[PDB]
Amino acid sequence: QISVRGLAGVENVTELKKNFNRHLHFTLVKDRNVATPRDYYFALAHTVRDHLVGRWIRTQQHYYEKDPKRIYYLSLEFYMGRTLQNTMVNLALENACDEATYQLGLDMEELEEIEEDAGLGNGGLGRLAACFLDSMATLGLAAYGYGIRYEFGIFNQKICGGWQMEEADDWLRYGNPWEKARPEFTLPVHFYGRVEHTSQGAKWVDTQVVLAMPYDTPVPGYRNNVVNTMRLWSAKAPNDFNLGYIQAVLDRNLAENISRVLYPNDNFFEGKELRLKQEYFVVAATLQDIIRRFKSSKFGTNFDAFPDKVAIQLNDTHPSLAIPELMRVLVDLERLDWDKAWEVTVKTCAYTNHTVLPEALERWPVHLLETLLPRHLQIIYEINQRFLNRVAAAFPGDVDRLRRMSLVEEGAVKRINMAHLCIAGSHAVNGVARIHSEILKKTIFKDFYELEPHKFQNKTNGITPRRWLVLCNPGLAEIIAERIGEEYISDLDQLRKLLSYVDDEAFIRDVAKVKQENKLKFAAYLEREYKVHINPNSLFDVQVKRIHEYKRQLLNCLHVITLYNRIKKEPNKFVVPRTVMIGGKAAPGYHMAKMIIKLITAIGDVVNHDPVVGDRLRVIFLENYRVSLAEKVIPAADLSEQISTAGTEASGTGNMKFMLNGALTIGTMDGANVEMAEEAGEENFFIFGMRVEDVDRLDQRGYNAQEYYDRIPELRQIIEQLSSGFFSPKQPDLFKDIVNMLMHHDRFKVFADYEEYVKCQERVSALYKNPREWTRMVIRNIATSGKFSSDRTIAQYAREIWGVEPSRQRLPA
Amino acid sequence: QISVRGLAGVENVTELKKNFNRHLHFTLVKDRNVATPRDYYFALAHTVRDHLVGRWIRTQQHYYEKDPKRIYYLSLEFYMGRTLQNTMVNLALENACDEATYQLGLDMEELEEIEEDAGLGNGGLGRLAACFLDSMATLGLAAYGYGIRYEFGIFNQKICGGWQMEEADDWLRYGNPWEKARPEFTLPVHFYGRVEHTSQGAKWVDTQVVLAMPYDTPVPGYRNNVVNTMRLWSAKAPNDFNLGYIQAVLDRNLAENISRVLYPNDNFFEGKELRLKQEYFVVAATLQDIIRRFKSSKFGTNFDAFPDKVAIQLNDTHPSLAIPELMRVLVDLERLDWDKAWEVTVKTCAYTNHTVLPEALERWPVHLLETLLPRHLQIIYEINQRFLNRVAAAFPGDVDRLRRMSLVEEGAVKRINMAHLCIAGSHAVNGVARIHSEILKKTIFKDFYELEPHKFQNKTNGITPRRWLVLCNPGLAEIIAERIGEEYISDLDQLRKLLSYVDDEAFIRDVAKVKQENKLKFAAYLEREYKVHINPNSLFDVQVKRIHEYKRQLLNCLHVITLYNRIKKEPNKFVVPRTVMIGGKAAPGYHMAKMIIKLITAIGDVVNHDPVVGDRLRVIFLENYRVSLAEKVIPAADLSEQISTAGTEASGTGNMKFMLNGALTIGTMDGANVEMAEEAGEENFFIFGMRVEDVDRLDQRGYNAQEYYDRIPELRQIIEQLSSGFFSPKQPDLFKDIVNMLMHHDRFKVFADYEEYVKCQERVSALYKNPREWTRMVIRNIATSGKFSSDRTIAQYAREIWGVEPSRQRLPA
Ligand SMILES: C[C@H]1[C@H](C)CC[C@]2(C(=O)O)CC[C@]3(C)C(=CC[C@@H]4[C@@]5(C)C[C@@H](O)[C@H](O)[C@@](C)(CO)[C@@H]5CC[C@]43C)[C@H]12
Numbered sequence A, B: 001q002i003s004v005r006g007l008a009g010v011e012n013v014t015e016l017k018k019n020f021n022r023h024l025h026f027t028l029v030k031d032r033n034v035a036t037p038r039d040y041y042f043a044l045a046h047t048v049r050d051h052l053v054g055r056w057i058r059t060q061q062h063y064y065e066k067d068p069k070r071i072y073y074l075s076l077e078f079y080m081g082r083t084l085q086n087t088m089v090n091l092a093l094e095n096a097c098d099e100a101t102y103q104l105g106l107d108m109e110e111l112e113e114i115e116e117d118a119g120l121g122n123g124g125l126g127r128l129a130a131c132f133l134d135s136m137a138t139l140g141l142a143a144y145g146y147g148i149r150y151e152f153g154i155f156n157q158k159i160c161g162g163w164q165m166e167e168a169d170d171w172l173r174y175g176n177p178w179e180k181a182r183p184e185f186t187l188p189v190h191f192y193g194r195v196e197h198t199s200q201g202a203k204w205v206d207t208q209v210v211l212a213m214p215y216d217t218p219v220p221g222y223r224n225n226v227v228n229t230m231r232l233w234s235a236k237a238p239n240d241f242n243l244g245y246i247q248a249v250l251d252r253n254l255a256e257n258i259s260r261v262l263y264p265n266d267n268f269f270e271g272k273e274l275r276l277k278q279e280y281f282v283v284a285a286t287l288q289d290i291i292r293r294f295k296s297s298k299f300g301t302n303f304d305a306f307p308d309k310v311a312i313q314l315n316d317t318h319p320s321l322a323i324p325e326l327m328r329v330l331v332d333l334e335r336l337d338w339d340k341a342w343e344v345t346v347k348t349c350a351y352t353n354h355t356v357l358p359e360a361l362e363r364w365p366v367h368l369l370e371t372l373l374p375r376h377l378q379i380i381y382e383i384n385q386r387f388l389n390r391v392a393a394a395f396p397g398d399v400d401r402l403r404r405m406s407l408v409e410e411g412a413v414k415r416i417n418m419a420h421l422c423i424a425g426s427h428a429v430n431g432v433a434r435i436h437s438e439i440l441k442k443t444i445f446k447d448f449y450e451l452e453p454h455k456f457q458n459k460t461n462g463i464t465p466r467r468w469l470v471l472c473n474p475g476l477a478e479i480i481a482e483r484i485g486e487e488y489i490s491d492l493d494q495l496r497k498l499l500s501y502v503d504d505e506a507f508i509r510d511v512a513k514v515k516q517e518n519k520l521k522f523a524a525y526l527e528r529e530y531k532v533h534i535n536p537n538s539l540f541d542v543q544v545k546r547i548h549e550y551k552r553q554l555l556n557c558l559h560v561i562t563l564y565n566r567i568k569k570e571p572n573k574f575v576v577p578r579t580v581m582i583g584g585k586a587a588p589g590y591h592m593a594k595m596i597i598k599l600i601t602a603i604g605d606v607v608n609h610d611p612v613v614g615d616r617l618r619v620i621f622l623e624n625y626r627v628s629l630a631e632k633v634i635p636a637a638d639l640s641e642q643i644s645t646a647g648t649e650a651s652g653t654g655n656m657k658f659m660l661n662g663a664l665t666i667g668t669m670d671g672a673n674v675e676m677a678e679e680a681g682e683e684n685f686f687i688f689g690m691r692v693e694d695v696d697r698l699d700q701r702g703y704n705a706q707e708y709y710d711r712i713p714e715l716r717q718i719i720e721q722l723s724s725g726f727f728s729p730k731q732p733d734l735f736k737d738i739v740n741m742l743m744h745h746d747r748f749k750v751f752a753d754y755e756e757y758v759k760c761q762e763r764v765s766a767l768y769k770n771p772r773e774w775t776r777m778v779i780r781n782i783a784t785s786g787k788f789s790s791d792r793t794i795a796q797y798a799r800e801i802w803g804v805e806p807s808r809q810r811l812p813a
């Protein structure tokens, strides 16, 4: 149908149809008489997977011959989503498969809906890992993603009586056609035991062994025939495990629980032992694999060359144990002296920080590490001692600096600060947006920055234009390609060329037409899947992201109620109709986040069934927000809500997805919003609220929520409604916690941004009344979204941290 | 190479080679540079599996169109062994694959050694199930095997310091290419809950749900293009399971433990709850599947026709809950009246008894069934009440009969007698050999036989000539085929024709040549795999079977020691050299069986390193006895030890394997030994010891072991050696338990058969000195082994129990 989806040429279509039928028959053991859409999905998935393997094998062949520097991206989360359409796109197979499936009497889009999300992440951090893998393959880097194959990913969210229910995400039930089990490359991981000292140094003995089994998933580059590997470790009991007899066999489960389930916490630390085991598990298996690969190369005994052959990137502090683990292997097993092992470690490792929120920082109780990893604690103490000697020598007499910079935190319970560990043992530390990187240098890591200024960098986050434009928004990609060609897909800066079309009447019409189609499709999705009715002519006001206080879903809630109260005051006045959509998961133990979800639904219960309101205001909670739901709602959005308190959202990536897909952004000067507004021009953005400086000023003076309550009658009315049970008639005091928090213990100053936010929202409504000017502003956003491609981000990592050159060159097919 | 292995015709060899390479590349994602033999095995296994699916699909198609009566074989054990060679044989692919793999530079035999045994059974009962499935497919029956897919089968046995160590049989580690997961056909199984009574009868409520997921494995008939199904159920937690959050996800393991591990007890009952859950699990899932298939047929609401469309065979009492479960479904769910449901149940079910040993009988505590299956206990009480009313009416006033026949056993703990349940609810009850079936009618089920004589039958066990001749002994199958053709493979009675070759000098030479080759190959296997040295010219004296007291491995031990002591007394006298091989697993908690294994190795420690003995006597314990080890040692055997106390071994099947493969049999008149001797003639068998009558006489008088000790000096010497630490110098009293048991509490009267056994063993040695007469006796055995084909057994089940006609007719290819 459309150009950007590739050629559907007779020879390919015929070959695809016959391999489809081969897989249906031989692989699935079905025929057309019994086959369900699921069977049809699998036959297609197997047919497409076949196209990868040749490229996969020769890519890995190429790296063996050329022996380039290898990039190892260590993350506990890879939020991949669906793989079918992404593979077709990157392989140029999408039209051919559409044709082949059409001719077999099947709708490919219906088949795509059957694939489970690989939901092995929580949100931003996990999805960044996924975008990174795509870009690394697209840029020809010899890169590997290493993580854990969780049996259960992020929970499926069900709304019941307005409340979140969690159910297990059993994503492997029907199988995963993309992975290849590699039991032959299984590796032992050690836990517990004790440390023995000898003439030949320390020995870690009497350990419990857990086996790590790798599963490989292909990662295709965009149209370059590069297929990299994501290797995920699964936990297996050894066969002499416990070995009355029955119980010993049943207790094998204990070892295998390590890889059972993803911890569902977004930006929040929980000091649980199982979590620490997961962290060491991925680190120990990966490092052995890295070293084995280093030794078995065309180059090489000599660990001097290690940093020239290996880069290890730590996605947050979750794989921070890679630092003492690498030291352990180099010192205890390879017999290098401390100072040489340490130079190698620092030159190999690099650390990316994702948040400044104190409750998100990993600080592990010493007594946990003592029991679980006795050798690693010793190495940590020794790293600390030598590091503190460097601080003492640089800042003599500064005793408070010493306690501030220590990796060991003193208190009732002694803790290891994992972020401090990462800084000390990495040659590079980066934040994920310019303002976030500055905040690190000025506040939380100020001391470390004064010691080693050269270590600190910025790498502003990015999103992949393949998944986040071509895949999810084919209509928009097509109208862009008509004017400027296809090269922008792997060089997103080229979208600037679209600025010379901002006054083009045909393009304006097309941009606005694609948005309307997207909105109509999504409104249909809501009716068919969730039996909910929305007006596709209203402004689609969308806030989708994890439910957190700092993300201020509550600020949005306050606006929504203001609009309702204004309508009820002046019913016969014209207002721009809105559909307000809020979506996101709450961590299971996060009580406040669960309350906010209930409020949102409770608001919808009042607003959606008020006859006076009509179709002018709708409030919808988007259930089970995840990657494949994002691919649908983002192209359909008019307004992107990015309203975190200034200085709390390190970067955001949702913000970029919306910019790329033709929504306008209302937001604070937080995270990457600042860089986005800078790229588009502040006139093309709806910026409101306190800057970082204003927050600090308010903190010094003290934040008093009562002040705003007293001076803003519209705010008072809302609080009285919440308190008196207007939104919960059966349980009048249901929302006492929310009101209490807002009035007395609001860390995120919801009320302080209320007035500016509401006023700015009026300016949004005003612009929406003039479709031509709205669309021209939209075009100005899309055209300047180029910088926020993860290809740019990854090229910066490659050049400034890893010391490798990106390549756009094809491998032979 | 050999005729019986099929054609290696240019077109087939070329097609096999290319599909091998296709699977290596696309399925395994390997190439010739990295591939190991394991990779080569899998590529072959996938290539062969491809040949099944077409036949598999059209067989199931055929049954849908014709709608024949369906046979359901319910067993908790299917001891399948390896599948590759068996599939090639039954498909006529063996020479073609040998050729194709040869031309790729691979040795197929080396590749076959890589396949894990599917060891989902303990011994006789489990292996009978496997032979039955082969024969049912070979005879064109619409038959299904239903069981449990254990994650861990029978443990691997390691010998350490002479002692058995058990390790987990992780047979699925590298995957199973034969099975096809069918998650779409998952079924709920209910546990616990309570019974509620209404107007519309009883309701089972508040149950815990466990999901049963089926895995299908193809079962090919011999050269007839019939491919039946073995369906094995795997336990899965439902997704709302328990649903703090983490723990709820981890506790999903509890539900899934149901299918985790096979209970390693051969002929012994253990009243564990997990075992009862397994039993109900397979029964509930299978019955739902049977009923669903019955309703969705070309025939049919009307359960009158159920017994015309369905036969359910119960392999022992392990699936006995099928009886109250079928009643439950018919009465509670389908709303049939009791009497009609009961008529349908009895006409549907049939029961096969496998042992008379009291400790093997399943007698479940009422309090277990009360908690786990409250509705089934009620149905059991009601079945019992109505059954006891029938007994009272037939034998008025006979109050002791009533208590004897009751399904409910009274005592400290009330128990359900599952065998009694099976007899009451089945139209047919059979033993597994003629003497065993008589013992049932005369002793343990005498009361039931007097009530319903028409219910009691014999079906003498059989073994499959495909696995147990063609597959494991190609050399012998070939020399037989040269004389009489190939038709005997699916009609084993034709082996009688070989009687006219008993005086043929060429045939005698060939039979003896094949045995020598078999012995040389096995002696080489022992050196290569276990670094043990045997003389291939000695008589191979072999006892392989589960380690049990009733099987009397100890009697064998006593002979072995007698031979040693005689040699040491008269060193320079000629004796026929023997290699005595004993093999078998002991149940982990069976202390005595573990002691016997230690004795056997302890004997070998003394005998094998006595220079005076030389190569005249060797005692070897065969480690990890299992199906694939049987396929190797059985063709290599000269003497088959079948020496159970008369009346204890219900049938035996090992005995038949040895007869078919050219060993002579020394044994008691026990089980099927009686029928074997009858077929060959007693002159061609080494029969010794008490008959059943003699045992009974000895029991009445009382068995006094001291009597034999006093009157047999050779026996006394052995006991003194055991007591004084001759066979355990470091631990002189190591064998006190064995001596004590022999002297004071021997249920199996080892000493009573000692003299006759030793004397008979001398007659065996005498015959072995004359190779020509030994071989002529061998030929007389092989030629009369026809009756012991499971094709015969299965045809008898089909005609006399199930009411279906066997067919040798091909399906179109
Ligand atoms: C040496 C092993 C090690 C035992 C485990 C880690 C290893 C790795 O580097 O990831 C596993 C994979 C192989 C076997 C490895 C190395 C090379 C091959 C290779 C590229 C070799 C090549 O000749 C084959 O054609 C091809 C291209 C194809 O078989 C292979 C692909 C597989 C690798 C990369 C590694």
Ligand SMILES: C[C@H]1[C@H](C)CC[C@]2(C(=O)O)CC[C@]3(C)C(=CC[C@@H]4[C@@]5(C)C[C@@H](O)[C@H](O)[C@@](C)(CO)[C@@H]5CC[C@]43C)[C@H]12
Pocket: A029, A030, A031, A033, A034, A035, B057, B058, B060, B061, B064, B185, B292, B293, B296
């Ligand atoms: C009705 C279902 C039920 C939902 C679950 C149990 C069932 C069974 O009888 O075992 C599952 C298998 C199918 C779907 C079943 C029935 C028929 C098919 C069938 C023989 C149908 C035939 O047209 C196909 O060509 C073929 C021959 C091929 O698709 C099928 C094969 C599969 C069966 C036998 C059963």
